[PDB]
Amino acid sequence: MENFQKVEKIGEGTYGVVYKARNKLTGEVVALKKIRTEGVPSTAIREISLLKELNHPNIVKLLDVIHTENKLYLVFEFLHQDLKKFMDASALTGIPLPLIKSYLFQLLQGLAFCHSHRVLHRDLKPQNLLINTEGAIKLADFGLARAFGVPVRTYTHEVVTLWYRAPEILLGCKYYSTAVDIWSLGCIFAEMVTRRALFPGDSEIDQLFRIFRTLGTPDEVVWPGVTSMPDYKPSFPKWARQDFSKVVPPLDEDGRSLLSQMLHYDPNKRISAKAALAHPFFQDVTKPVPHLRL
Numbered sequence: 001m002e003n004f005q006k007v008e009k010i011g012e013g014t015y016g017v018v019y020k021a022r023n024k025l026t027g028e029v030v031a032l033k034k035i036r037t038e039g040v041p042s043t044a045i046r047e048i049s050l051l052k053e054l055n056h057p058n059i060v061k062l063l064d065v066i067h068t069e070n071k072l073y074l075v076f077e078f079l080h081q082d083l084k085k086f087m088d089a090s091a092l093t094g095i096p097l098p099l100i101k102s103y104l105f106q107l108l109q110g111l112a113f114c115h116s117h118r119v120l121h122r123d124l125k126p127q128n129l130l131i132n133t134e135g136a137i138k139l140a141d142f143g144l145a146r147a148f149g150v151p152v153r154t155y156t157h158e159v160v161t162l163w164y165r166a167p168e169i170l171l172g173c174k175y176y177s178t179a180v181d182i183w184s185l186g187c188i189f190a191e192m193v194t195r196r197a198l199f200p201g202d203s204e205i206d207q208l209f210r211i212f213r214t215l216g217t218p219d220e221v222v223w224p225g226v227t228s229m230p231d232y233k234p235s236f237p238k239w240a241r242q243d244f245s246k247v248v249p250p251l252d253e254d255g256r257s258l259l260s261q262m263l264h265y266d267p268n269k270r271i272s273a274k275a276a277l278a279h280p281f282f283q284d285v286t287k288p289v290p291h292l293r294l
């Protein structure tokens, strides 16, 4: 490219292909994301550009928004490995508890920061949580969903993971809140602990029913207004809530209580990132260094 040198394709992102690139004039290595047509919405460019101002140790920095030759690219700081790969790599022994606790703590800090700045992510998943050799973890892509109009599927004819989608989204609610990110993070927390996805749905209804079979089919008592959600159906099977100690064994009671507050059905009852940072679970949090194979 005119201003970069491709090092390799890193993967397929929500909004387009992502490459590990080298800046032609600086020599710096970055994550270059090509945004997948109409004419590159102007509202999106202005809105995304505002995100360049976000700076926090737990948020992947957006270095630039490049609009040239009528194509759009997002330039991000390049991190060492993603949480999906790290979890896969730690499958045999599992991620040590102190490291799980540290990552969760840092992710909540990133969420608290973004949410305090009126920015939501809406699509948190292991793939956009990036780690480095020093023990930090950062969230990438905050604010892109609101700015863009997340297409049903990628122009790559691939597949979109639904595993971390909040129930209000699955029920067709078109108004998002900070709670959708707490739900996703809760799902990720459970996955780090058990070494298996909490709700690995293969479709939206399967995703929804997997949640119902574990936490119980929601009703007006635990979630006022649920029966009026866009895609709610009175014909949904009525599953009883499962013993929560069966959900994420063998995590201790502080971890289980915090997780239960991150997974409340009613977005309004779901714990905020700020309040979660004060939960007793983090009383002994530290910052361990991960064993990363690059």
Ligand SMILES: C=CCNc1nc(N)c(C(=O)c2cccc([N+](=O)[O-])c2)s1
Residues within 6 Å of the ligand: 010, 011, 012, 013, 014, 018, 019, 031, 060, 076, 077, 078, 079, 080, 081, 082, 127, 128, 129, 130, 140, 141
């Ligand atoms: C995976 C480690 C390489 N270093 C990276 N560094 C960054 N900043 C990456 C990303 O922001 C990212 C986020 C979601 C999906 C993909 N993606 O390529 O599909 C890439 S990836």
